[PDB]
Amino acid sequence: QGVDPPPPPGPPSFTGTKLVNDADHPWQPLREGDIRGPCPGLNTLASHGYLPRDGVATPAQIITATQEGFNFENNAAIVATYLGHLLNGNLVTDLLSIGGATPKTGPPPPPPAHAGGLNVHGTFEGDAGMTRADEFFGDNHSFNQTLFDKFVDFSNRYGGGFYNLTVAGELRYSRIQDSIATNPEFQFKNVRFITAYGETVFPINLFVDGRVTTDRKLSMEDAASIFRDMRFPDDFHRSAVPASNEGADQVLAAHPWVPGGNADNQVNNYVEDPDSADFTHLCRLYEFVVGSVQELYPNPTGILRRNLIKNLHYWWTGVNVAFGGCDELFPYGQL
Template structure:
């Protein structure tokens, strides 16, 4: 196992943790499901959209950007896991399990495990002093750990400017919605556009990488767009019947803004449709190799079963690569947060304990 490898010396770890332990936070348990989980107005008087202030952070996730711009999250773009889980449920009616899993996945690879803070965009001092390397603590802008290539409206890292809205990609989304959805983004468009984005990246990005966890979050964003950005009053609970108009899509993707009078989903939802999108064009994880376009090679070591134990185990390995030899409160916080992440997998997977137990 990877966690048997130790990269930092004992003295390096001890010195770093002595400096940082005073800022450490004991991770609280994630909040539970919200009390009322039906549709309701979310673009309301208590949550007005406000333009960015100097220093406010936004990133590659339009949903989180929107929640911050409406005050469901701190408007500066730095939040705790509890704030993100609650905001995702309150603002979008995101299913509790999906919100918990996505939040702790992001925190474990992109956040500060000492201070319990995550930037929804780039690296910032507002998350506090960093744990020792090779930890990144780079926020969601960090490439190829949670976010990555083949995004719906953000450019691949190879082309630069990952977090910014890309009009060219959005124009492609509009074109696919016109061709396959009569002007709307629906489940059919989601599958067609996702496969197009993968093939386009293979043909244009010599560094294209499409392995876990990005392999799964890419399909996830295709489904989240349909599940969370459609007004909850459309009375369409059937997955195949949901559709997103392009004006609403633009409001989320470009402006980080709920449309006027927007109501959240009519029931808790999250990864509905991911399997259908994946099944439309079965595609294995892999990458372009040798720095060449159109040179995609499958990676048999990357899991491809959505929701399977391989996904969980592979993610734990990636966390361990960032924290190979944690000490003191950092080890404690890793154990606790990995256990929170494990929750949705507990019914079918054995818990991985690379750092032991408390």
């Protein structure tokens, strides 16, 4: 009949480096029914058993796994997790697929809500990723070797054969240009505009071994291991401090860019969207997503309403800090 969802975990008691690829968290191959998706972080945590190996988890499990496995900073974890859960999870069973649809999330919600997982395109998952292709081309979730070859090429050209912040700036812009030129449905606004800059520094801040204190750069071997194989590097130690999107501002500054998309189902036709969230208007992202949730859940009652109210509040607790203060919205009132 349903779960009563607990508030998110706080930061871990211990926030230093440690071995995370350890005997208790072995890489294992996929079994029948195991779900993986567009996030290499969550994929790796699932494939090492930091998350349930089937790739379906509670918000609380995701937050603790990202903290334990990578030292993802607590508020960043809260912002990402409840965004994903509100839009793509089952609020009654409190389960989120890190990939596509699965009976493992339990009885479906009332449409147009779907609990279809992180693979669902258009409000969270979006275009111009590093190792995943745009949904327009037919597969937004699988590793794409051609795109990884470009990652390697840009690492050779700008990072001495490694991925570093200079490479991130160049690759992000070039990937936007690829999508402008080839994807007539290309969108780069609202949630995606914000998440696309953070995702380009996560490999530097979180995939580079935490024992490396200076000149942080990711080898192509380690990159392939995580992005393709969902496997921690041998002897991997997590970041020595909680971390998330440090340096994302510099990635944007290297090639200033404005939220928008290709208009009128045509390539090379990018039009700015002045109403979109951007990095000096972050609260628009909060308002936009609350609106999206109302479209998914036009008139909830009972346990569904209760769990929506709670999850919206949990998300706001992270957003309020991460975005430097946003007025909380109450689309369904209070408990």
